[model samples]
Structure formats: C-alpha cells, structure tokens
Target: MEMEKEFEQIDKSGSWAAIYQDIRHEASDFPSRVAKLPKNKNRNRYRDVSPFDHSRIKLHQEDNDYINASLIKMEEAQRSYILTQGPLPNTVGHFWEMVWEQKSRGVVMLNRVMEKGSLKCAQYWPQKEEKEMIFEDTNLKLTLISEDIKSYYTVRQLELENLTTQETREILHFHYTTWPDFGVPESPASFLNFLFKVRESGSLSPEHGPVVVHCSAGIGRSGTFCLADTCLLLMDKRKDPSSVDIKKVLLEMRKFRMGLIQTADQLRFSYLAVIEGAKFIMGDSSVQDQWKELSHEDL
Candidate 1:
C-alpha cells in the first residue's frame, strides 16, 4: 500500500521514530479518569440533530466491490445518532459518509468501539440492533481493535498503526490528560513545520493531519485540541486569524455535529491553551528573533 511505502522512507529519515516516541510519551501521561458533562434531560433534543434528515443522504446497496454507503454533501453532511441495517440492506460491510464540513481536508469515519475499556459510555450507541438505526451526530469513529475479527473495527488501533507508518502524512495522537501533562514546547512548531511539508508535497499527509484528542466521547480533549490548533495557527500568522472570534467557531461546529466541547469553560481553557502553545512554539530560537519585540499577549 502507499502508506507502507511511505513508512519505509520515514523510518529511514528518523522522523517516524521521533514522532512515535512523542505520541507514546504523551499517551503514558494520559489520565485514567476524567470528568464529563452530565447527560441532558431531553434525550430527544439530542436526537433532533441526528441523521433524521434522511433526505440529505441517499442510501444504497453494495453491488460491486467498493462499499455500501450514502452520498451526502461533505460540507453539509447529515448528523446520524445511530447506524442501523436498513441503511444497508443485505450488506454486511461498513457504511461511510462523506463529511467535509470541518476546516481541514480529511475524512473521518464514526464507528463504535468496545464498551469495557476507555470507551464504555459510547455503548449507548447501537451495536447489536438488526434494524436500521441512525447513529448519533458524533466526530468519533470506532474501529475493531482485536486480532480476532468480531465484525468490528477498532479506530484506536488503526489510527496508531497508521501513525507509526510513513504513509500517514499527518497523525495527531490525542490523549485524555490535562494540558500540563502532555503539553510540549515543540508541538505547535512541529505543526507549523508539517504545514510547510504539506506545501512542498502539494498534498495532505494522512499522518500529519490535525490534532487528534480523546476525552470520554472525544469532546473535551478533542475539542480543546481543535480549538488550540486553530488559535495557534492564527496566532502564528502575520495577521490575527481571530476575525470571527472563538465562540462562533465552536457554535458553528456544534450546529451540525452535536455534543462538541462548546461550553464556556472548555472554550476559555482552549483559548488559554492556544496562548501557552503559541508561547511554547515562539520560544524556539528559529523564530525567536523574528517576533522578539512583537507582543502576542494582545492577540
């Protein structure tokens, strides 16, 4: 596969090892327990944003060899609360939706992982229903992780293996931990370098994609990471990328994808995180002289 070939080259360059070590180190610091928001009293209110808009997506059966799936606008993809069988009649394969609403250029598949380990709460999602059930509007994907094929995909395993490989151009390994635990001085700067590498390659690298974060349901940590990434990128630019403000960004993202980390506390934390991340990167000697006299506190 293309990813395998890239892995070989990256292994030779020593970037792969450095990146993997960094991720492992970060993972080791992850917290075993973390706080989450209380469930809403109105369950149906949450379902309102689900894949009820069947009109927005078209269901189909897998006849040839590609895969059974639906065609939805990447930018305006429908939100689904459950993934049922009616969506794929007579098909035992996976179902995928094209979602491009996010600012980055990448595809994220939402699947359910196991319920025994770190992802137990997500068990509320459909796993054994025979009928067609709509999946929740979530940014998470669950891939089977076990060596045994129990008809499930563990996204965690696939993601990590990909991160270890060179073909994976951009891999953001997220963990459930406080910022102080996993914060690294070079993270934002590494991200900047990744963007430059993307420009040179003229294409996005799967391994070097946006930050990946996980904090029970992929909301708090993931959302915080996304916000920090966006803010840091903007702060690093010659001009402030905060034209619209940060709250608007979260609201917009949650408008379609429900359960995002859009709370006031989370946003404030992410805003502060961006400053710390930017400062971490700015302290580097390479760009120190360039912005030595410039003030970022105002930004």
Candidate 2:
C-alpha cells in the first residue's frame, strides 16, 4: 500500500528545502497593530517575529497587552495553541497574565532557560529561593509545586495564583530541555516522545484552553511543534490520511501567525514527525511504544 508513503518520499528526495522556501514565499504580511507599538517595542524578543493583529491574543482589557504571542487555532482539528516568544525580563508578568487571561492549561517550553550560553527564556517561574514569586503588575503569583527532572525533559507543576481574586490554577510546564544547537531536536522520535507526554497529560485537550508553547523567537521550533501535532490530528480524522497536505496545512496555520515551521529543516522535521506519528494515530498500538523506545527517553 502506498499509504502514508508520500511524506517519506519527499523527505528522502530532499524536496522539503525547495518546498520550505515556497512556504516562506507565501504571504504573512498581515499588519501587527500591537506588535510595533513603541511602548511595546522591547516586549518583543526579536526585532521581527511579531504576531498578526487579527490572531493576536487580547488580554482582558487589561488593554494593550502586547505580549509576543499569537493564538493559533486549528478549528478543523479542534486544537488551539498559543505560540509565543520566550519570556523577557520585563514581560514575565504579562506572560503569566496571558496564561491567566487565556485560561491555558499547559505551558510547553521547547527551549531551555539558557541554550548554548544564551538566556533563551528568563527563568520566569519559581526555582530555588523564590519558591513563590508575585508579578505585581498583573497581580499573579507563581509557586513551584514539584519538579520531575529527566534526562531530556523536566515537568514542573506551577501553581499560579490570582492575587486579585485569590484564585489558583495549576499550570504544567513541559520543559523540553535538550533541543539541539540546531533549530530542531536530535530526532523525530525523541520529539514525538515528548509531544506525546504533553498529549498524555490531557493539557492539549480541546475541552481545556490553549497550551502556551514557545521557544526563543517563538516561531521556529514553536511553529514546528504545533504544525506537526495539528497535522497528525487532521490525519487521524480523515480516512485517507495521505490527503493531509503538510505544506498547505502549515500555510493555513501561518495565516493566524507568521513564519510557522521556521527553517526548511524544521519544515522537513515536521513532515518526518507527522509521518512517523501517523502510525500511532492509525491505531498501531505498538508504534507508540516503538516511538518511546526509539525516542531515547531513557537518555
């Protein structure tokens, strides 16, 4: 059966490079009404990489909440993801505010706090001494509940408290600690293993709010992660999963937020992960375990 052979053929043929360039050529010039505000200038981690005005997450008038985050919604897949930049020093308060305002169930941090000696994300949540820290600007307090550190990832339970109303919510931080110096992970299997862990937690469920997923610039790895997950879910819904055009699906997602699936390699890796992951989606019960073993979660 030709089955899902289409994606793998493209991967092997190395056509993803050309395909990726075309996707980049596609339009994402939607004006960022809030992203370029002089007041919100430094709130962005990069000079470029701003959220489109249409799909940018609005705070509870709580106005001008100019966090570098985009609300990426795949209504067909019944999935929602908030793709945002790694928190800068001044924006940590608003990061929590965005989570609180969005009612997000999970925060997926793809890049470590420091990567290759660069501070990718401000160690925003609680750590050693500051077990409980308050963001006075937004009146949110975060308490580090428990941390399970593994070789490649760490799961930290952050207890977020609304100081304004004394409301408390538990936010799971799935920190993928070991992404490579290169933009993508070491392997698709390892990446899928971590993604499945997030899925298993039910944090990415439709019943809940969007999961906040981020890397340094927010678009590159964040885009790849969300794109692969959405495509697999789309494949799961269709009789002919092969019909799920990876590039087109990614292009649709780019409409909500710019520059998703950053590099050609990230675009390529998304295809690899989605194709590898579709086996599990198609009810190959053993394939998930195969991913786990192939994933080197033991590492």
Candidate 3:
C-alpha cells in the first residue's frame, strides 16, 4: 500500500489541486505560433487549446495543412502517440489522411461523437456496417467492417484504403464511451480496462507509427489517456512503480501540446489509475483480476 499511501497523503492534504496547477504553471510561456495562423485559426476546436509550435503534426497535406494534432514522441519511453482534437467538418478528410499517412494502426477515441447537446466530435469514419466512407479531400476510403459494443466502450474494425493505389490496412478503433460530457471519467479502474485492452491489441507498440488519439479538444481527456498509458508502460519495463514520477510524466507530455489533463480530478485519476494499474506489472496476477472485477462492476 506504499503507492496508495502516497496518493492518500496528497488527497488528504488537498495538495492534488495545488499540484495540478503547479504543473500548469510550469508549462507557461510555450508558443503555439502555427495554431494561431490566420488561415488555420478555424481548424482549432477551441481558441485556447492550440497545439504548441514545436511538437504539432505539421499537417502533412498535398496542399499543406493543419489539423490541430500534435505528434508526441517520448524517447525516454521509446513510444510515440498523436494527440489531436476531434475532427472538424472540414478536417474529417485530413483526420483520416493523418492516420493513413502516419501508418498508425489504431485510433483511440476518448469521447463520443455527440455529448449532451453538443457535438463533441465529427463523424469521421464509416457509419453503417460495411459502409464505405470516401474522403474526397484526401482521396482515402474507410469501411466499418465490424463492431463490438460494450457498456463503457466500443471496438470497431475498419479497412482504410488508398484510392490511388487501391491498397488498404486494417485499423482498430478503441472508443471509451462512458466519459462524462464535460468532465473526468468515473474512475481510472474503467479507463485502465480500456487502456489494457488497447495495449493487448499491440497497436500502441513502437513497431507502428504513433496511434492517433482524440477527444473533443484532444488535450484534457486524450492527455489523461496518454499520460497513464505512458507511465504504466514505463513502469512495466522498469518494474519499479515508485520510480515513475507521474507529475514529471505530465510535464513531459505538455511539451507536445498545451493544456493537458484539464482538471485536477483528471490529474488525480491518472495517479490512481497509474498506481492501481501499476499493481498489474509488479509481479502479481490478482491485481489484473482485481482490475477486471472493478471494471466489470461498472459494465
């Protein structure tokens, strides 16, 4: 319970709030020059949550581009992940093109297309089963070949094709559907369940280009997802949970994009998820069983 004790003391003293802000404070003064371009301003889902200038995806387009996505590579952990805003109406094709060109094997979507009365994300993929979605802007096509619906998340099988070459690659969609419309998830227990399921797919490995991850703004929820996954993976290899500084990990993540883990609650959940999830890598099988049961209760 050493890990739990650390979390407890922080929670008990109410330092989680202060600590979250401190991380935010340290990231001040970073520039997001590209996202502020007059021509590209409409591409951002929000005015404030622009991707930083240094680590953004640079919008690989035949006509040149900007999709409000950031390419985050953690050389320390030897993994890469792309954190991006949900596709805008005009950028849907670019979103697909980003995935296709990057050679990403999976897309981990953390928000539903519609949340509450708001449109959280664009319908960027094939809607109907076996239906083909062709993006003329990028000349790429996607078909939703199969789907498996779960209570808190959904998994879909997609076939992405290059219209020019007629070549295609299968892409996995990992969607965690139960996140709150405007806030943190219920618990890290459920999120970790979805996280490990994505891991089990082998799509997050270094073998592929960065897996594209998105939420509405793509910083808060997506940031939380990447932080926990990155930390847990590092701990899995290092095998020392305490050595992983979750705070430092978040700071490193912010270098790629601005305003990650938007709420203190999300930050707190990441700590819990990492610690609770860490038990799985620390020479114990029951923790995963424990996690499975914990996540199943929410189902």
- Winning candidate number (TM-score): 3
Q: List the residue pairs that clash in candidate 2.
A: none
lDDT of 2 at 298: 71
Estimate, for each residue in 30-126, the C-alpha lDDT of model 1 and write its tens digit.
1111111132122111222232232122223232222211121212112121112112222212222221111122222222233234332233212
Better candidate number, 1 or 2, judged by TM-score: 2
Candidates 2 and 3 compared: the better one by TM-score is: 3
Give the C-alpha miss distance for residue 79 in model 2, angstroms. 0.9
Q: How many angstroms is residue 204 displaced in model 3 relative to the true structure, after the best TM-score fit? A: 0.3
Cα error, residue 156 of model 1, in Å, equals: 7.1
Candidate 1: stretches off by over 4 Å: 1-220, 239-244, 280-299
| C-alpha lDDT score of every prediction, in listed order | 0.30, 0.85, 0.85
Clashing pairs in 3: none
lDDT tens string, model 2, 132-237?
8989988999999898887788899889999989999999999987888866765788888889999999899977789999999888889888988998888888
After superposing candidate 2 on the true structure, give the runs of residues whose Cα lies further than 4 Å from its correct spot: 1-4, 8-13
lDDT of 3 by residue, 176-217 (tens): 888877667666778888888898898898788899999999
Model 1 clash tally?
A: 34
Error of 1 at 44 (Å): 12
